[PDB]
Amino acid sequence: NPCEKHSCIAVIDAGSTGSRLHIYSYDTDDTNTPIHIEEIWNKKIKPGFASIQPNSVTIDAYLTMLLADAPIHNIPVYFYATAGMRLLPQSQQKKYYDELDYWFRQQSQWQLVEAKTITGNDEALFDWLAVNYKLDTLKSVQNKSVGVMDMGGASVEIVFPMPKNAEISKHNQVELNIYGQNINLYVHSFLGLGQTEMSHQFLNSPSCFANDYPLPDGESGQGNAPSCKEEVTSLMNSVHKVNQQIQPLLALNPVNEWYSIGGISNLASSQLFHFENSELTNQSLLQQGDNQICHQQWDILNGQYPDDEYLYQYCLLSSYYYALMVDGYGINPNQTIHYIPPEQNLDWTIGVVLHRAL
Amino acid sequence: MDTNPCEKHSCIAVIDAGSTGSRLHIYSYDTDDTNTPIHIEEIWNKKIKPGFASIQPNSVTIDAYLTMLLADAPIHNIPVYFYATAGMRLLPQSQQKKYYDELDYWFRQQSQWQLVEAKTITGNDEALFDWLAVNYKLDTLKSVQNKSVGVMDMGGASVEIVFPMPKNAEISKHNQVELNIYGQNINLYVHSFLGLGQTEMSHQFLNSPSCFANDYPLPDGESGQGNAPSCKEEVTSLMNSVHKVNQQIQPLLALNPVNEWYSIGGISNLASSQLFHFENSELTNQSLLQQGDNQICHQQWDILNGQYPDDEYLYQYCLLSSYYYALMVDGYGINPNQTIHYIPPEQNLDWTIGVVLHR
Ligand SMILES: Nc1ncnc2c1ncn2[C@@H]1O[C@H](COP(=O)(O)OP(=O)(O)NP(=O)(O)O)[C@@H](O)[C@H]1O
Ligand SMILES: Nc1ncnc2c1ncn2[C@@H]1O[C@H](COP(=O)(O)OP(=O)(O)NP(=O)(O)O)[C@@H](O)[C@H]1O
Ligand SMILES: [Cl-]
Ligand SMILES: [Cl-]
Ligand SMILES: [Mg+2]
Ligand SMILES: [Mg+2]
Ligand SMILES: [Mg+2]
Ligand SMILES: [Mg+2]
Ligand SMILES: [Mg+2]
């Protein structure tokens, strides 16, 4: 039991597609800041918490499946929900939390500290802290700028260093002091631009699916990734104004190394795609989606990869990630984007260990 | 209505499995000289939430869902059509198939309901049923019509539009349907826009302060600062820059004017709110947008919320007023002063009578 000799907390990432419990052990330095953070347990369940019916029976079944088999309990729990809950008004979210609070009050294995929906900006801060914790770039002043993108199912987050600025909304800027270093970040989350929510606007776009893929409207796919990418960009920019918000800031505050977490890791590591060194470029992701999915005959390709239930969307996703990173954020198509191997189950929850405010 | 109407008339069950919920209807009818239904009467209705597509597809959850939908119906030994719409269209076929395999098995394990079909219908079929159902209720199907009747179905995940249009070999055969009913030949244009339903579309504007009442708490922690003209222009970008609604629809309506517009779906719920002032179950887009702007967008959220404790969807009314105008006016090109009839929401009117007529 590592929790006998080290501080332990549980952090739950309640994401739009699933919930992930992590138990972390850690020590603290001279300032009571965590160090030597180690994940001692994880459990992932689907579907997303916001997708279940908020009643006592269903909430119990879900929380039991997430938590009951954990080898360690009697520890503090932070239950932080993200874009899945943000899609609901507070009045509806409150029913989930009233039931979840009751569930925790009716048991003794877990000590609930907080259960709340965090903002996308809070999520983006955690994303940057988690990745930079893993990269060991927090202990000393970096002479490289590290930017983080979290490519979620309902929202996407972008976060990078930016000096404090009186012109930009306070909500989009965070100052923290960690390991005696003062860090100032720009944060932004785009609700609705996660892969699931985005996709619901393009299901009848023939350019976004393999040839003869059966579109729900009865037309056939006729894949073409550059054309699909142009359609997605209209959502990124004409609707959400991603380019106008993000590009001038990155021009002034270049990022030297980009890391991406979230579902893009699963796409990049899938059997259809081929990348070395756990990194990609937008140019190569768009070309590979174009040639290996968009330009293929759907029934033939589906039958080649029988077990693969994400495949059908890869023409669209490859196009969308390019639209978002290149046409939205302004990233060069040849710029390396590091992605974290999915096997690491790396989400933003280490950021909560490091940073207990919101 | 007779006691035990199904002992005296033909009966069928039609289930609208919509994105927000499923509605069972049982209709009695007689048939005329060609075995075509007449005197269609709803004898039972049950609506359950949430949508079929939102459940986890396994035998336990499907059993519980269909039991909740069907078990207390007053008659079970009748044909059943289970037609899902945009909620299921959001899913790939492989994912949909898990639902239908479980549903089929459930029907085969019981011996009363007579399952005829359980499938996802296209938005084009849905729009055909929308037009048949509304025109059946208006009694415009028997005889050739003076005026063109158009129907809009303002759903949670998709919206449908349908109106008379002579055959055009230059338009996809999927967007056209010829029918012969009660001895008359009718040609319709049909179209559905997936993702432009109220729920799906709203997920692109939740952090737009122009689309919410003043001081409404947006998810990103900023405050509402409502302005319906502003929010309408945001929504029009999704309609047109993204979906090309105007390019698709406007050239056809210009050339095939609709004399009378009817809307069904969730729009009747908005228009019925005590915040609005409409007469004769009809609205105009201009009046909808101005009233949303003044009564919701530019009002204080906490005030509004305490004042209308019976409007569950109140928080969305600024956005929905703006959205309806963007879709109908900037998308379809309908004049903002053109009357739009809405069917009183107590009528629970959906497209399902269309299936009684069309099968
Ligand atoms: N095995 C897989 N292969 C390919 N793609 C996958 C796989 N598993 C998950 N994904 C994709 O990743 C998406 C989920 O990404 P993820 O970053 O976990 O989102 P989330 O945290 O649940 N949503 P959000 O609340 O917006 O952060 C899913 O919708 C899938 O599309
Ligand atoms: N009582 C009500 N008051 C106000 N708004 C309501 C009310 N009931 C439903 N609505 C709105 O109408 C929506 C449901 O519209 P509806 O026509 O039932 O869509 P659907 O058929 O479930 N989806 P689709 O598959 O796209 O047709 C809900 O999401 C609400 O936002
Ligand atoms: Cl469709
Ligand atoms: Cl947010
Ligand atoms: Mg228990
Ligand atoms: Mg996430
Ligand atoms: Mg959804
Ligand atoms: Mg490989
Ligand atoms: Mg509907």
| Cα distance between residue A288 and residue B111, in whole Å | 52
| Cα distance between residue B202 and residue A62, in whole Å | 27
CA distance B322 to chain A (A): 15
Q: What does CATH list as the number for B122-349?
A: 3.30.420.150
- Give me A345's structure tokens: 């189950």
| Cα distance between residue A199 and residue A277, in whole Å | 28
Distance from the Cα of residue B200 to its chain's centroid: 14
Q: What is the CA radius of gyration of chain A?
A: 21
Residues spanned by CATH 3.30.420.150 within chain B? 122-349
Count how many residues are written for chain B: 359
Q: Which of helix, strand or coil describes residue A78?
A: strand
* Top-level class of domain A1-118+347-358: alpha beta
The amino acid at A215? L
- What's the A282 CA to ligand 8 centre distance in angstroms? 18
Residue corresponding to tokens 């260990």: A353
**Method of structure determination:** X-ray
Q: Which residues of A touch B245 (CB under 8 A)?
A: none
- What's the B157 CA to ligand 3 centre distance in angstroms? 10
Q: CA nearest A231 in B: which residue?
A: B242
Cβ atoms < 10 Å from Cβ of B112: 12
- The stretches of chain A forming alpha helices (DSSP H) are 56-67, 83-86, 90-105, 120-135, 195-199, 225-233, 242-252, 264-268, 282-289, 298-304, 314-322, 349-354
Q: What does CATH list as the number for B1-121+350-359?
A: 3.30.420.40
Enter the resolution in angstroms: 1.5
Task: Give residues with Cβ within 8 angstroms of B61, minimum separation 6.
Answer: B55
Q: Which of B14, B16, B20, B315 to mutate to test the pocket of ligand 2 (most atoms within 8 A of CB)?
A: B20
First to last CA, chain B: 24
CA distance B219 to chain A (A): 6
Residues spanned by CATH 3.30.420.40 within chain A? 1-118+347-358
Closest Cα to atom 29 of ligand 2: B156
DSSP B248-290: HHHHHHHHS--SEEEEEETHHHHHTSTTS--BTTEE-HHHHHH
- What's the B249 CA to ligand 3 centre distance in angstroms? 16
Q: Are B263 and B152 in contact, with CB atoms under 8 Å apart?
A: yes
Q: What does CATH list as the number for A119-346?
A: 3.30.420.150
Q: Which residues surround ligand 4, an ion (CB under 5 A)?
A: A 119-120, 189, 191; B 219-220
Residues spanned by CATH 3.30.420.40 within chain B? 1-121+350-359
DSSP B88-156: HHTS-HHHHHHHHHHHHHHHHT-SSSEEEEEEEPPHHHHHHHHHHHHHHHTT-SSS--SS-EEEEEE-S
B206 and A86 within 8 Å at the Cβ level: the answer is yes
Backbone angles phi, psi at A160, to 5 degrees: -155, 160
Cβ atoms < 10 Å from Cβ of B314: 20
Task: Give residues with Cβ within 8 angstroms of A19, minimum separation 6.
Answer: A12, A13, A44, A45, A48, A49, A62, A66
